[PDB]
Amino acid sequence: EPRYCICNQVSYGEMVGCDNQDCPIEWFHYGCVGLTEAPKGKWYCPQCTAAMK
Ligand SMILES: [Ca+2]
Ligand SMILES: [Zn+2]
Ligand SMILES: [Zn+2]
């Protein structure tokens, strides 16, 4: 029921959480952010990565 990610679709498949506390979206599908495997440490989504540089 809740929609997640930049794509605004329900949770499906492998999901990753952005570790920036102010991330507006928080939860993303792996594919929508270019991942194939679980991050081995903290992970920041592309939008938060752009905001942190
Ligand atoms: Ca949304
Ligand atoms: Zn998505
Ligand atoms: Zn984020």
From Swiss-Prot:
Query: Can you name the source organism?
Result: Homo sapiens (Human)
Name the site position(s) for Histone H3K4me3 binding. Answer: Y4, M15, D19, W27
Entry superkingdom: Eukaryota
Which positions does UniProt annotate for Zn(2+) 1 binding?
A: C5, C7, H29, C32
Q: In which tissues is it expressed?
A: Expressed in brain, heart, kidney, liver, lung, ovaries, placenta, prostate, skeletal muscle, small intestine, spleen, testis and thymus.
Disease (UniProt): Squamous cell carcinoma of the head and neck: A non-melanoma skin cancer affecting the head and neck. The hallmark of cutaneous SCC is malignant transformation of normal epidermal keratinocytes.
Domain remark from Swiss-Prot or TrEMBL:
The PHD-type zinc finger mediates the binding to H3K4me3.
According to UniProt, the name of this protein is Inhibitor of growth protein 3
Q: Which family does it belong to?
A: Belongs to the ING family.
Describe its partners and assembly state: Interacts with H3K4me3 and to a lesser extent with H3K4me2. Component of the NuA4 histone acetyltransferase complex which contains the catalytic subunit KAT5/TIP60 and the subunits EP400, TRRAP/PAF400, BRD8/SMAP, EPC1, DMAP1/DNMAP1, RUVBL1/TIP49, RUVBL2, ING3, actin, ACTL6A/BAF53A, MORF4L1/MRG15, MORF4L2/MRGX, MRGBP, YEATS4/GAS41, VPS72/YL1 and MEAF6. The NuA4 complex interacts with MYC and the adenovirus E1A protein. HTATTIP/TIP60, EPC1, and ING3 together constitute a minimal HAT complex termed Piccolo NuA4. Component of a SWR1-like complex.
Q: What residue intervals correspond to the zinc fingers (PHD-type)?
A: 2-51
Signal peptide range equals none
Where is this gene product found?
Answer: Nucleus
Amino acids binding Zn(2+) 2: C18, C23, C45, C48
What is this protein's function?
A: Component of the NuA4 histone acetyltransferase (HAT) complex which is involved in transcriptional activation of select genes principally by acetylation of nucleosomal histones H4 and H2A. This modification may both alter nucleosome - DNA interactions and promote interaction of the modified histones with other proteins which positively regulate transcription.
Q: What is the lineage of its organism?
A: Eukaryota, Metazoa, Chordata, Craniata, Vertebrata
